[PDB]
RNA sequence: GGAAACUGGGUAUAGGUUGUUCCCACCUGUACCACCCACGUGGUGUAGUGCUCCUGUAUGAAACACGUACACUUGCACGCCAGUUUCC
RNA sequence: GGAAACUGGGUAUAGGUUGUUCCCACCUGUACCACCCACGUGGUGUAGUGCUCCUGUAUGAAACACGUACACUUGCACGCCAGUUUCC
């Protein structure tokens, strides 16, 4: 039975400065052989911890590690902004190797209302026959919101994808996209396409909208 | 100094095979155990394979049983990853990393390759078709409008956006490609700027979609219906 | 000012197999700058743990460090008969380095009974106007014995003295001398020289007796 | 290979004053701290002083501030403690240590020298005489037979004790030495023997006594009618 | 006191018994009772030596394998001790 | 199209100017409220550059000192965005 190890939490948010801890926990013994890395997107993996205490050369001193049992916590005792990234145990007490889930850590800011826009399919696209709408959030906080579209005021489900951006390096906000996509023929077929954004920054949802047509 | 660089990687159809390569520099690896690690876009790190030095002992994940087989020719200081059967759920990107020697790292994995990317799909490889998301006629939002370029039914992974050569990069969001249904990925890249400049500056986005060198430039403006 | 480093047990017993925990308390913070070293009697320390928790080069891996807070613990997860030793911490955080006072680990084992021998002073001290009278008890288990001695039956005090083997890193048997001193005058007032030896591996007490003049 | 070597221990009147000196082999002492840890018999370890390398830093316990003065002999790869105005509490065995590697261990002290006793008295040095512990008269047990040396009266420590100049090894029992009220010490060097061994072996134990010189050998047999 | 040959944990007991006077040894059976294993229908003087076998620990650029060192445990041989018998 | 000069956090609010339209490009006082410091009776478009200043970090056989690399924080100048004003 492979050694499982169950990372937690799988995200947190703090502010420069703050001491934060992230745990693994090891399903079935693994004595001390285990390494923790730092991701950023983009790019490969950096040793930090190893032996689970171990300060790998050349790596801050903000950053060790400690074990407990079979737990096992990486703690940043003051976040750098360069160490917002994601970061992974590792279990090489016995092959297979094991990793962890992996923890993102986000800067935390203050709560910033997304900025709606909305973006009629092209001219050009509608000629080969295929409709895309698009709405943008931007530059928001949290993470968290939802955006379902309404054409002729009927939600759709299942024709829609959104995709976001990682948290920007100056300000600390997301941006989102939202994308519908139609053929052209069933496109011709309504008016009124809204884009209705609920966000914890919104007191109450944003709806914008355009008329198919008339701009 | 020390590194190592992957290569070998690219588009393979489903049931298809890949050997990919793990080119060492500033040390040899006849001493050192080498392993393949892996990451699906968006999700952890996935151990795949090993070897063990002076004996050549293999280690595979179970999802990988069967299908690869890790190997190492010391005569180029390089490291091989035979894959057979692939599908598509082995998309991901192939770091080789190595093994720390024990006396200083323990068996941490202490230098990783920048990674090459697999993509496992029976998609055909096509260049984009690039569409305007021009600025609202009336009100996209308002204050500083926005406006973009919709980066749609490209294949394999990956898409450069630029704006105006590179000249023009505050405000500007390129989002993650989205797989589409269709086995074609799109991604949308977003500028906002001041509404006055709307009637003085043009906007132009470079595409370039290097699997199929195709560079398209796109200029966006208000629309006039 | 300086930093103390308060250790505790500072001594402890116990067998092979068991789980051993020496905890050092750092009086104001030492970072994670603790070391761990075993001295055996006579010798110069060894090495065990550096930097609170990273195992020393050629140290058997049952050794372990741990750090919590100002907390550090030397574990050894499986006492071997050769961990009979005193063990150290240090903080070497600031000057000036300090240690703890160190725990003195010694053995648990089956009870074993002493072997009694009585010596008789040498020809060669009597000239010198002195006797000696030594009572030797051999390779024992536990260390609490009791020596007697008697002159003619007369219960001796307050003219011998004793003398302990560190524990036997090997079976952890102990011996004892015990030496009892006369002026030849008040020596040769006697004939019987007893030594009585109670301990617990005995049924009831051993004496080992002499007559002085008689071969 | 790697090692050090204290000497320059002894015994030294309250108020005067010692040169201690650690001869380093196997490696460079210009590249590491090297810390002088003293040790009262039977008691802990206690931190001295120490230098740093490249600026030759010194740091100095709190109680042999201004006393003792820790320095380095670069180009005879040795230490050395200047000891001055000894007062009695300054009686320990005197341990240089080497601070090891900062990239291998940290700040612990790996290599440590055997140490040099320094004893701070106003009493005179003086040798042992040996007598011996005669093996059993009525021959106690039909099994194993004791018998051994009784090294009395000396000052100051230590002595050692040896069988057979070192061919008897296995039995040996020397005791930790006693102060006796005349303030002199007195050990007990004892070991068992198989009861025939008698007669057919010879058995001489070998006193060393080093603070005065004295070596003498002593043969045991039971005693004679 | 020499030289050889034989035997080897107690304990208790039925005993037996240098074939001779109870029985010292010898010699077992039995019940026991311990110590030690790799735990059986098991083994049984032993801090010596060689080899063997069982593992553990540490290390060699070294998770397995392979080397080296150190420990651990089987067994055998030789030595040593304890008897015993025998002759000088 | 040149050339020049000048200005710079919101938000309220009282003024000044600007054409006159009641608000403007703005700008000043004040309050409130932020971000930033090395924390004041202080500072305020800015992911660029140089110098500087403040610390930190890593590393050099390296606890201090010394070297090197990298970050950080002042302040300044240039560049950049946003404006005005002016002149050809």
């Known amino acids: 039975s492979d050694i499982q190890m169950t990372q937690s939490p799988s995200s947190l948010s703090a502010s420069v400065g703050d001491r934060v801890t992230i745990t693994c926990r090891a399903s079935?013994?693994?004595?001390?052989?285990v390494a923790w890395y730092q991701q950023k997107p983009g790019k490969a993996p950096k040793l930090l911890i190893y032996?689970?205490?171990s300060l790998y050369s050349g790596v801050p001193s903000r950053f060790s590690g400690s074990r407990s049992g079979t737990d096992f916590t990486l703690t940043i005792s003051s976040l750098q902004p360069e160490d917002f990234a994601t970061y992974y145990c590792?279990?090489?007490?016995?092959?297979?190797?094991?990793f962890g889930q992996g923890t993102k850590v986000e800067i935390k800011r203050t709560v910033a209302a997304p900025s709606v826009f909305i973006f009629p399919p092209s001219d050009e696209q509608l000629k080969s026959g295929t409709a895309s709408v698009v709405c943008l959030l931007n530059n928001f906080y949290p993470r968290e919101a939802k955006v379902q579209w309404k054409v002729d005021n009927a939600l759709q489900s299942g024709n829609s994808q959104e995709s976001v951006t990682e948290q920007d390096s100056k300000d600390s906000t997301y941006s989102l996209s939202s994308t519908l996509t139609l053929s052209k023929a069933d496109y011709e077929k309504h008016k009124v396409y809204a884009c209705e954004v609920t966000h914890q920054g919104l007191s109450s949802p944003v709806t914008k909208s355009f008329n198919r047509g008339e701009c | 100094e020390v590194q190592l660089v992957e290569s070998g990687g690219g588009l393979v159809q489903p049931g298809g095979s890949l050997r990919l390569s793990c080119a060492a520099s500033?040390?040899?690896?006849?001493?050192?155990?080498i392993h393949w690690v892996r990451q699906a876009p968006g999700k952890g790190l996935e151990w795949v394979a090993s070897?063990?030095?002076?004996?050549?002992?293999?280690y595979y994940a179970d999802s990988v049983k069967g299908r690869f087989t890790i190997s190492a020719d010391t005569s180029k200081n390089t490291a091989y990853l035979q894959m057979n059967s692939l599908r598509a759920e082995d998309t991901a990107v192939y770091y080789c990393?190595?093994?720390?020697?024990?006396?200083?790292?323990?068996?941490?994995?202490?230098?990783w390759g920048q990674g090459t990317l697999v993509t496992v799909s029976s998609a055909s490889t096509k260049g984009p078709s690039v569409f305007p998301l021009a600025p609202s006629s009336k009100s996209t939002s308002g204050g500083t409008a926005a406006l973009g370029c919709l980066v749609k039914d490209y294949f394999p992974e990956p898409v450069t956006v630029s704006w105006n050569s590179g000249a023009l990069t505050s405000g500007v969001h390129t989002f993650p490609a989205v797989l589409q249904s269709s086995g074609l990925y799109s991604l949308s890249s977003v500028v906002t700027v001041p509404s006055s400049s709307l009637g003085t500056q043009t906007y132009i986005c470079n595409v370039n979609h290097k699997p199929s060198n195709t560079k398209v430039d796109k200029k966006v403006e208000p629309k006039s219906c | 000012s300086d930093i103390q480093m308060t250790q505790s047990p500072s001594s402890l017993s116990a067998s092979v197999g068991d789980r051993v925990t020496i905890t050092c308390?750092?009086?104001?913070?030492?970072?994670?700058?603790?070391?761990?070293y075993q001295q055996k009697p006579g010798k110069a320390p060894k090495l065990?743990?550096?930097?609170?928790?990273?195992?020393?080069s050629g140290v058997p891996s049952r050794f372990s460090g741990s750090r919590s807070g100002t907390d550090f613990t030397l574990t050894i997860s499986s006492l071997q008969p050769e961990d009979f030793a005193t063990?150290?911490?240090?903080?070497?955080?600031?000057?000036?380095?300090?240690?703890?006072?160190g725990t003195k680990v010694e053995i648990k084992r089956t009870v074993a009974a002493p072997s009694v021998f009585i010596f008789p002073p040498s020809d060669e001290q009597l000239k010198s106007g002195t006797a000696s009278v030594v009572c030797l008890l051999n390779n024992f288990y536990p260390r609490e014995a009791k020596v007697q001695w008697k002159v003619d039956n007369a219960l001796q005090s307050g003219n011998s003295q004793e003398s302990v083997t560190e524990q036997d890193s090997k079976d952890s048997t102990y011996s004892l001398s015990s030496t009892l001193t006369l002026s030849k005058a008040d020596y040769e007032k006697h004939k019987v020289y007893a030594c009585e030896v109670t301990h617990q591996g005995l049924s009831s007490p051993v004496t080992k007796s002499f007559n002085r003049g008689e071969c | 290979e790697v090692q050090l070597v204290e000497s320059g221990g002894g015994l030294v009147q309250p108020g005067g004053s010692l040169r201690l000196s650690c001869?380093?082999?196997?490696?460079?002492?210009?590249?590491?701290?090297?810390?002088?840890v003293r040790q009262a018999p039977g008691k802990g370890l206690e931190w001295?002083?120490?230098?740093?390398?490249?600026?030759?830093?010194?740091?100095?316990?709190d109680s042999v501030k201004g006393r003792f003065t820790i320095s380095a002999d670069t180009s005879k790869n040795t230490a050395y403690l200047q000891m001055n105005s000894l007062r009695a509490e300054d009686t320990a065995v005197?341990?240089?240590?080497?601070?090891?590697?900062?990239?291998?261990?940290?700040?612990?002290?790996?290599?440590?020298?055997?140490g040099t006793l320094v004893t701070v008295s106003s009493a005179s040095t003086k040798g042992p005489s040996v007598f011996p512990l005669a093996p059993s008269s009525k021959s106690t047990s039909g099994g194993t037979a004791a018998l051994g040396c009784l090294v009395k009266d000396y000052f100051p420590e230590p002595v050692t004790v040896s069988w057979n100049s070192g061919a008897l090894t296995s039995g040996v029992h020397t005791f930790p030495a006693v102060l006796q009220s005349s303030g002199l010490y007195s050990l007990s060097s004892v070991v068992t023997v198989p009861s025939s061994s008698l007669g057919t072996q010879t058995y001489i134990c070998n006193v060393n006594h080093k603070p005065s010189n004295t070596k003498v050998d002593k043969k045991v047999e039971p005693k004679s009618c």
């Open positions: 070897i063990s030095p002076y004996s050549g002992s293999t």
């Open positions: 032996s689970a205490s």
């Open positions: 590792q279990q090489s007490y016995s092959f297979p190797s094991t």
């Open positions: 079935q013994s693994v004595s001390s052989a």
């Open positions: 990393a190595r093994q720390g020697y024990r006396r200083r790292s323990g068996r941490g994995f202490d230098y």
């Open positions: 500033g040390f040899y690896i006849s001493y050192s155990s």
